[PDB]
Design a protein around this nucleic acid. Structure first.
Lengths: 83, 133, 190, 22
RNA sequence: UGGAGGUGAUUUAAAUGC
RNA sequence: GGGGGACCGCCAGUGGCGAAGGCGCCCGGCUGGAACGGGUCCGACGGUGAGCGCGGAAGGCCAGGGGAGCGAACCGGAUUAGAUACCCGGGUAGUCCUGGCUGUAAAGGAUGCGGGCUAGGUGUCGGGCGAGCUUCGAGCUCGCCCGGUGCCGUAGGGAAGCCGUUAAGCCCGCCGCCUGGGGAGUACGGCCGCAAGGCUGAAACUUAAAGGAAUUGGCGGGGGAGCACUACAAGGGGUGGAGCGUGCGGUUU
């Protein structure tokens, strides 16, 4: 058990052939597990994806989805910005 | 030097022949004394040229000046390779070394199939559909 | 390392107990007395017929070194991959024939013979060609001296005597001594 | 295919059999 | 003339279309 | 020079043995099956086989012992748009041995077993026989026969591929199983199993197909043969740099 909260920037990005991607950045890499979070998020989006340094990337526009899934998990509605 | 009657020396040359590298290694007829060890990745700078024939002549020419330096003029060549791990068949330095000895001037006696070949089975890597391409 | 060369000693091979002091073999080495058990390969140029021709590769071992002179015994024989692959054929057989020997001199000697079969009908006469080797060999070792008994086997004499008997039973071809290994030296009384 | 199905069937079975066992 | 084995295998050639 | 565990290339065969899973260094002891010559003995004692009983690769599991190489999981690198991979470097269970459990498969010849009948040819393994050869051993060969193991093919069968005296022919005896697809080899119930699981086994609902063989064509990051000059090499010149002419994209109007 722990806590930790962070400022979250979500936005459309760019990958090779195929569609745009969705970046979710600004999580505390000590406390939060981007690999457990991201496995959970690829399930919600239903997209492939990775942990890209300190970010999660999700293939396609998932911007309303993810914020809606992050707030559920007990993250603050007021720390999140969809751009 | 305790008096020599023949006035000719002989140095058996082990030739270890990989598709990743070539090693040439000539010793005395006993094998208890190593004059010289020279491979194919001191000659060059890169991994791709580590084998080939051209490293496997030049490697076999630097050594060949130090065997001339001892008195070794006759050489038997013992061609061999990794057999249990990989495929027994010699790589690009086998046709290369013997060309590298006829140019160096060292005489060529016996040329020999002494490569490790198991009388038996040992499981290498690579299964289900063997090693896959 | 950094031999002038002058930390390099030289010895000379004199290998008897199969022939006289075969002068062949010259030994360089660094320091004194690091070769006293080191093994030398030779074709043997004593008999330039068979011992040069079909008997390529014998191992001799310097049991001692005296005044810087190497005394060398018979340690072993081994044939090259050349031999064994060449001879063998299909729809026939290749056989192999051990015997753990004891001669009257107090040496034990491990032989493996190799004969190649005459075509069809593979059977219990195969192992009986096996049996007629281990019987005849035991009896020649007990009778003959050891130094002699390592001249005969290495020569074709043994391959020849084997064939006469074994062609009565079930005719053979391409019989030989594949390899020999010195089972036990010491003596009859240690 | 039948790989798929066997493990899907197995996972369904287990997970559900987990839910029955519980 | 048509059939069965044993082992090299070749990465220099890129997801999708109602 | 020493120590350890695994295994036994070539041999090796279109080969042999086994009910099946399966089985391969050599030697000896114990032991299963099998062929043939002679039917020498029993005198229908036979077939098949629900239930029932038994054997059953690999993986897994249990307890003990062992552990080289290899290697699920796993740990790194690369690759890649990303790679939970192909490729490479480490690596545990396991792979080995002993005792037990478990009981599954494209466990195939996708072809239950037994008997009789129905052109042939050829190769091969083992046994018999009449000869010739002989190294005087069936060692090298010819042919008939018996048992097995392949391939080719007449009559016939088959939808066709193919099968065709080793039947998928033609008959006679028994046994298992099937009755369109998907739902579903799932639910429930019971039985078995240490566990993992196995054995048995629906219905609601839904569909005008599921499927099989061959034909044609197009296609494949497939192979052979052959050309070409809108091909490429070889070769000569030049476009792309500037100025201008022109047609266009755009913008402006």
């Amino acid at each position: 058990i722990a806590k930790e909260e962070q400022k979250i920037k979500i936005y459309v990005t760019k990958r090779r052939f195929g569609k745009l991607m969705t970046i979710i950045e600004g999580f505390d890499t000590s406390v939060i597990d981007l690999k457990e979070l991201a496995k959970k998020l690829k399930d919600i989006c239903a997209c492939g994806g990775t942990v890209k340094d300190n970010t999660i990337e999700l293939q396609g526009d998932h911007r309303k989805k993810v914020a809606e899934e992050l707030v559920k998990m007990g993250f603050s509605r007021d720390s999140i910005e969809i751009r | 030097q305790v008096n020599i009657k023949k006035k000719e020396k002989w140095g058996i040359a082990h030739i270890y022949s990989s598709f990743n590298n070539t090693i040439i290694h000539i010793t005395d007829i006993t094998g208890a004394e190593t004059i010289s060890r020279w491979s194919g990745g001191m000659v060059v700078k890169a991994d791709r040229d580590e084998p080939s024939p051209y490293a496997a002549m030049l490697a076999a020419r630097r050594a060949a000046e130090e065997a001339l330096e001892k008195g070794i003029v006759g050489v038997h060549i013992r061609v061999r390779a990794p057999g249990g791990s990989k495929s027994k068949t010699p790589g690009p330095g086998a046709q290369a070394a013997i060309r590298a000895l006829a140019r160096a001037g060292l005489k060529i006696g016996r040329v020999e199939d002494v490569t490790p070949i198991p009388h038996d089975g040992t499981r290498p890597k690579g299964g289900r559909r063997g090693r896959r391409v | 390392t950094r031999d002038k060369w002058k930390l390099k000693q030289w010895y000379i091979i004199y290998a008897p107990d199969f022939f006289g002091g075969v002068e062949v073999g010259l030994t360089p080495a660094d320091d004194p007395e690091k070769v006293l058990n080191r093994v030398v390969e030779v074709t043997l140029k004593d008999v330039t017929g068979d011992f040069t021709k079909s008997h390529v590769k014998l191992y001799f071992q310097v049991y001692d070194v005296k005044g810087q002179n190497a005394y060398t015994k018979f340690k072993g024989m081994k044939l090259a991959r050349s031999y064994i692959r060449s001879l063998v054929r299909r729809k026939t057989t290749r056989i192999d024939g051990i015997f753990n020997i004891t001669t009257k001199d107090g040496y034990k000697l491990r032989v493996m013979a190799m004969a190649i079969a005459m075509r069809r009908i593979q059977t219990s006469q195969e192992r009986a060609i096996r049996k007629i080797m281990q019987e005849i060999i035991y009896k020649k070792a007990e009778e003959l001296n050891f130094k002699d008994f390592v001249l005969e086997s290495v020569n074709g004499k043994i391959a020849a005597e084997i064939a006469k008997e074994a062609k009565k039973i079930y005719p053979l071809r391409k019989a030989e001594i594949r390899k020999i290994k010195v089972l036990e030296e010491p003596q009859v009384i240690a | 295919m039948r790989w798929k199905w066997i493990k899907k069937r197995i996972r369904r079975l287990k997970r559900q059999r987990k839910k029955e066992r519980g």
